[PDB]
Design an enzyme around this catalytic site. Structure first.
Site, PDB file in Angstrom:
ATOM      1  N   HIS A   1     -20.195  12.084 -16.280  1.00 22.73           N
ATOM      2  CA  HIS A   1     -21.104  13.257 -15.774  1.00 22.73           C
ATOM      3  C   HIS A   1     -20.930  14.010 -17.018  1.00 22.73           C
ATOM      4  CE1 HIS A   1     -22.103  16.511 -12.932  1.00 22.73           C
ATOM      5  NE2 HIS A   1     -23.190  15.793 -13.163  1.00 22.73           N
TER       6      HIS A   1
ATOM      7  N   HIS B   1     -26.755   9.058  -5.389  1.00 22.79           N
ATOM      8  CA  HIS B   1     -26.959  10.120  -6.443  1.00 22.79           C
ATOM      9  C   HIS B   1     -26.204   9.536  -7.794  1.00 22.79           C
ATOM     10  CE1 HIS B   1     -26.431  14.379  -8.065  1.00 22.79           C
ATOM     11  NE2 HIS B   1     -27.096  13.594  -8.927  1.00 22.79           N
TER      12      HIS B   1
END
Length: 1045
Positions: A362, A317
């Site tokens: 992120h 991921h």
């Protein structure tokens, strides 16, 4: 050349002075670096005779040549040219710890880098008996950091717990000593080895007994004692041929090679190699006899021919984030680790960067920044080292167009030849096969055709400190997570010891236990003389007492033992007599070992004397913070006890006291209560909650839907606290309460509810926060990038319309949807997957990074399931299994059967049938690792992690304390797990400790794709969660994989 190799190895053993940089410790330091061959370790010593730190070569993952990782980037590397530096990465975890060494001069570096590689190759191929020696050597090295040849019985008593074996008795160690044959209580290294080889044999002797069944044809000799009976070459062969099956030795000559390899005998050579009943047991529980077939340990070219779609490509991921998705530090290294593990599908989320160059972080989260350029160099250099088959980089771009250009230029230049700019097979009916694209990167970006989550300081009504928490706003609810990470202090001072006899007793004890030396001492206040003290010390088997006199000279209090020497403090006086001899008319004696056990557990606040069991429970209920603890003398005994509050319930666990040792449960031996509290604050006593709050009197005055709530919450599993924003109206407050000036408040409209006081370091956040709460209360893609994306296309399509698959296009179903697809209609996902790529991905809820059950998806065609790799969960471990199969390549050809006309990924129960009948029986263990401060009872659970239709567990009875040789002596066991479809399955062996309050805790897991299980007695190497390998561990098992027809 053999001559050459030896020369290099010798150079390492002597050692060279090579500066050692780390990001910690600022400026560089030079510590001599050596390879200590018997240990198999590398060590850096400030001078000589001290070993500050060790790596284990057994576990060096990579030895990259230049100044590229951390360390060297940090601070200044002015002194050392690029070629000279060599950084070594050693670890058992995901984050890999780095030792970075810059040789003074060029020549050495070449040696080392060659060198470490030369050694590392060896270790991996060291035979089991050779490893043990090193371990034992390692342990001896432990007692005293500096190398010592021999160990005193006392010390052996310290070592046996760390090895995770509990001494049955003082008697037990002594009797074994005799047969080892050193009567001086100074076991020799050579003897120690004789000890280990005995101890292990005595405990596990039962396993050997099992073979002795008529018609086995192993016909093992009498197993009475080590060195009794033998298994010689003729016999070993007949075991290798019948009990275990391995036609590798239908031929005698190779059997001999194996046996010779095992013993590492040297002398004991020539004579047809023979194995002692003891050794047979050391072979059995060893790498050489792994349940793992060697066969499926090499790239199979025949099966790398089919098209990409039919392969289960490995996947990550987020790859950049090492750890939790909210606060994690992301680093280039994070990628390097993933690709070498053999993941072939790194993700690379990119956001706009300060000065043109993109940066990776992120999104909206506070995770650190990694320059794109650096990610790119790193993808290239280490991409195809482990495996040549192709990477499937999956850029997702939030980046602006101007920034995107830099990206595209970079990709083509830096990656160079590799980037798959032109479709390989021209028109191509179906996707190119991995072999065709070997050594080639593929890029998947969209083809041309917020929530104010921040870390906020929080104030508390009770303990008076602000505790940092990450906070998220969704559904008008702030959601918050647990908190983000002279003589009076001296051991020898015993304050008020009530009686002279008590001081005498304490000294007598301490001296009896370890072997007290003359000058062993304590200091106490004088019962007879106010303001004076009494030094009590051991001499010639008796306790002596000297009065430390006090006097006032010039307004300053001074202390003295003799009238000629005055000291400003008792500390100064004692330190003096630790260096200098106390001279009295009858003796000269220097103060040696301080004996520090007055009443450490009495001065401190967190102690209740005589508190009733009932009353405390009540006392505790009043302070509600989870992780508060009260320490209470049990009435009518010596035995102190501990009560803490967790999960609402108040549970109290009994502390017994044997000698100057507190034993929480059976195993622990904290020296002093002060320690028992301290250790558990750092670690975890119950579930995962440390004793964290002391239930002081003073403080006392001061004070399934949940699962459903968890799913919705932005912070999800991580977060403790949900406050409805509706109820509390935001105010902004000038000035700072308790410092932490920039601040805001959430006064509730109703008077009763407490005013929570979230506050922040940055005003901007405050503005952001204040506005955000206040509000609650009231096509892109630059063409060039597009050209690159030749294969794997983000599809603009109705995630509904599985069918009419287009080879080049890849769909990206999020996990939740995916299950649904998989349940609504099984077959369609499969059909799309033949001839098309699907990349399932982790849901946003999982801030924690625990990974979704990969197994269902894979069964029905999902080329790529991305499981967060920075996690230790069961599911990631199942991933590390499927990918071992067919090399570390990271492609495993899907079973031929799945492709066909009528294969149902999740079929009806009646139709499925039975194909295999594995029959594990767990017979053994060895060196199971120790977790905390307790000998760890071990229970093993066999599992068949499976598609839903097949799932089973067969827990094995717990065994009391004994890590080195836990023996489930044929206790029935004999589970018969049944596997419906062989080709995708997993046999999962997990060994879980049972500690104190009965909660399973996790030591080690073995995961193995069912195809690669070998029949007969075999040893399953055990591995820590991040699935690296722990030292000589194992669970001998007796897998029989009969097929049923």
């Amino acid at each position: 050349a053999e001559y050459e190799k030896s020369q290099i190895k010798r150079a390492l053993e002597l050692g060279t002075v090579m500066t050692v940089f780390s990001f910690r410790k600022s400026t560089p330091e030079r510590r001599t670096v050596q390879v200590i061959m018997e240990t198999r370790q590398v060590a850096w010593s400030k001078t000589a005779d001290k070993i500050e730190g060790f790596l284990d070569i057994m576990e060096i993952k990579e030895i990259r040549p230049g100044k590229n990782s951390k360390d060297f980037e940090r601070a200044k590397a002015v002194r050392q040219k690029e070629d000279c530096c060599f950084t070594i990465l050693y670890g058992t975890q995901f984050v890999l710890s780095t030792l970075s060494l810059a040789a003074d001069s060029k020549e050495d570096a070449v040696n080392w880098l060659s060198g470490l590689k030369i050694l590392h190759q060896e270790a991996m191929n060291a035979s089991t008996p050779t490893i043990i020696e090193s371990w034992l050597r390692k342990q001896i090295y432990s007692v005293d950091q500096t190398r010592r040849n021999s160990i005193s019985l006392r010390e052996l008593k310290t070592i046996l717990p760390l090895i995770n074996f509990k001494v049955s008795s003082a008697k037990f160690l002594k009797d074994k000593f005799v047969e080892i044959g050193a009567h001086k209580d100074e076991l020799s290294f050579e003897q120690f080895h004789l000890f280990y080889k005995k101890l292990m044999f005595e405990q596990q002797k039962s396993i050997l007994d099992e073979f002795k069944k008529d018609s086995s044809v192993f016909i093992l000799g009498n197993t009475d004692r080590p060195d009794a009976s033998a298994v010689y070459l003729h016999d070993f062969q007949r075991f290798l041929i019948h009990e275990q099956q391995e036609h590798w030795a239908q031929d005698l000559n190779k059997v001999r090679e194996r046996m010779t390899k095992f013993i590492d005998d040297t002398m004991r050579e020539t004579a047809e190699p023979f194995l002692f009943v003891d050794e047979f047991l050391t072979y059995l529980f060893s790498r050489e006899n792994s349940i793992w077939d060697e066969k499926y340990d090499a790239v199979d070219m025949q099966d790398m021919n089919n098209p990409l779609s039919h392969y289960w490509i490995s996947s990550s991921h987020n790859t950049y984030l090492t750890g939790d998705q909210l606060r994690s530090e992301s680093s280039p290294e994070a990628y390097i680790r993933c690709l070498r593990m053999g993941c072939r599908c790194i993700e690379l989320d990119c956001w706009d960067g300060p000065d043109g160059k993109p940066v990776i972080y992120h999104g909206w989260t506070r995770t650190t920044k990694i320059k794109f350029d650096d990610v790119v160099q790193a993808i290239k250099d280490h991409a195809f080292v482990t495996s040549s088959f192709p990477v499937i980089l999956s850029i997702e771009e939030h980046c602006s167009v101007e920034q995107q250009r830099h990206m595209a230029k970079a990709f083509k230049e830096v990656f160079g030849d590799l980037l798959l700019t032109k479709p390989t097979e021209a028109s191509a009916d179906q996707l190119p096969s991995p072999s065709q694209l070997r050594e080639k990167i593929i890029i998947k970006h969209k083809k041309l055709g917020h929530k104010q989550q921040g870390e906020l300081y929080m104030w508390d009504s009770i303990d008076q400190k602000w505790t940092r928490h990450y906070c998220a706003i969704a559904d008008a609810k702030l959601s918050f997570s647990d908190d983000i990470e002279l003589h009076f202090g001296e051991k020898w001072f015993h304050k008020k010891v009530e009686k002279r006899t008590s001081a005498e007793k304490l000294l007598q004890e301490y001296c009896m236990e370890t072997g007290g030396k003359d000058g062993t001492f304590l200091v106490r206040e004088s019962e007879t003389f106010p303001n004076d003290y009494t030094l009590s010390f051991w001499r010639s088997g008796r306790v002596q007492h000297c009065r430390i006199r006090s006097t006032m000279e010039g307004g300053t209090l001074k202390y003295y033992l003799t009238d000629n020497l005055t000291f400003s403090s008792i500390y100064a006086l004692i330190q003096h007599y630790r260096e200098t001899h106390l001279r009295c008319a009858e003796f000269e004696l220097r103060l040696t070992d301080p004996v520090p056990n007055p009443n450490p557990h009495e001065s401190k606040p967190w102690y209740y004397d005589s508190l009733s069991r009932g009353e405390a429970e009540d006392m505790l209920m009043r302070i509600p913070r989870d992780g508060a603890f009260l320490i209470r003398k049990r009435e009518g005994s010596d035995s102190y006890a501990i009560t803490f509050r967790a999960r609402g319930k108040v549970k109290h666990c009994r502390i017994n006291r044997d000698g100057r040792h507190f034993v929480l449960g059976t195993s622990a031996y904290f020296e002093s209560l002060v320690e028992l509290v301290s250790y558990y604050e750092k670690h975890s006593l119950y579930r995962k909650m440390r004793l964290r709050y002391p239930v002081t009197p003073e403080l006392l005055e001061r004070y399934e839907l949940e699962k459903q709530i968890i799913e919705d919450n932005p912070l999800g599993s991580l977060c403790r606290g949900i406050l409805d924003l509706n109820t509390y109206n935001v105010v902004k407050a000038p000035q700072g309460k308790n410092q932490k000036s920039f601040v805001f408040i959430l006064e509730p409209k109703q008077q009763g509810d407490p005013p929570v006081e979230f506050a922040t370091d940055r005003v901007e956040e405050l503005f952001e926060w204040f506005q955000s709460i206040r509000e609650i209360t009231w096509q892109s893609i630059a063409i060039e990038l597009s050209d690159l994306v030749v294969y794997c296309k983000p599809t603009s399509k109705t995630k509904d319309n599985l069918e009419n698959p287009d080879f080049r296009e890849i769909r990206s179903f999020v996990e939740t949807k995916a299950d649904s697809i998989i349940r609504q209609k099984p077959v369609d996902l499969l059909k799309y997957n033949q001839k098309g790529l699907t990349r399932v991905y982790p849901k946003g809820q999982r801030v924690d990074s625990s990974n979704y059950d990969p197994f269902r998806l894979w069964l029905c065609g999902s080329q790529m399931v991305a499981l967060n790799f920075q996690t230790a969960d069961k599911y990631m471990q199942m991933n590390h299994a499927l990918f071992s199969l067919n090399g570390r390549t990271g492609y495993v050809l899907q079973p031929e059967s799945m492709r066909t006309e009528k294969y149902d990924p999740m079929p009806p129960e009646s139709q499925r049938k039975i194909l295999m009948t594995l029959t594990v029986k767990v017979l053994g263990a060895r060196h199971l690792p120790k977790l905390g401060r307790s000998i760890a009872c071990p229970f093993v659970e066999v599992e068949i992690c499976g598609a839903e239709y097949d799932n089973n567990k067969f827990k094995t009875t717990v065994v009391n304390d004994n890590g080195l040789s836990p023996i489930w002596a044929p206790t029935q066991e004999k589970v018969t797990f049944e596997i419906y479809d062989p080709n995708l399955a997993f046999l999962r062996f997990v060994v879980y400790e049972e500690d104190m309050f009965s909660d399973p805790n996790f030591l080690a897991h073995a995961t193995y794709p069912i195809k690669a299980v070998k029949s007969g007695f075999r040893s399953v190497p055990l591995k820590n969660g991040y699935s690296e390998d722990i030292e000589l561990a194992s669970l001998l098992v007796f897998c029989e994989m009969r097929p049923v027809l």
